Design a protein around this ligand. Structure first.
Ligand SMILES: [Cl-]
Length: 154
């Protein structure tokens, strides 16, 4: 076989759920850790795209990391494709039967969901990459990002 094996890793991060309200995304960032450095071995916080941008910016400009490979920022969530397509669909409502339109409305909702899912992955991959870096996983701004249980913006 050919296989990548992880045994009792000390830091695991994922985004198990997320919420879109008028195309504004809130990510649940859930962490599991066996490390002393964290207040708790398991916890979740709520993060927005700008929080991730904040974290990436502040790592990039950390003098000590200038020789390190910092994983790329996740891209800003963008629902313009699905939204514009749904608008076009609505304009064409008269040319179409009730059940044709229903079926297509459902298909475009699925298109929106696939965009959502993709931006989730992008944000999650970034955190997982940071958790795997021997130096960056220890960064205190990263820790603040994972655990500060209030609005990181303010
Ligand atoms: Cl957003």
């Amino acid at each position: 076989v050919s296989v990548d094996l992880n045994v009792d890793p000390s830091l695991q991060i994922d985004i198990p759920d997320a919420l879109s309200e008028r195309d504004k995304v809130k990510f649940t960032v859930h962490t599991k850790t066996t490390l002393p450095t964290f207040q708790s071995p398991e916890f979740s916080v709520t993060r927005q795209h700008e929080d991730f941008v904040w974290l990436h910016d502040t790592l990039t400009e950390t003098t000590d990391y200038a020789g390190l490979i910092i994983p790329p920022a996740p891209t800003k969530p963008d629902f313009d494709g699905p939204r514009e397509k749904m608008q076009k669909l609505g304009e064409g409502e008269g040319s179409m039967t009730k059940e044709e339109f229903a079926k297509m409305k459902q298909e475009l909702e699925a298109e929106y969901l696939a965009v959502f899912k993709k931006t989730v992955s992008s944000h999650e991959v970034f955190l997982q990459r940071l958790s795997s870096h021997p130096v960056l996983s220890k960064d205190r701004n990263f820790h603040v990002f994972l655990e500060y249980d209030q609005d990181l913006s303010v």
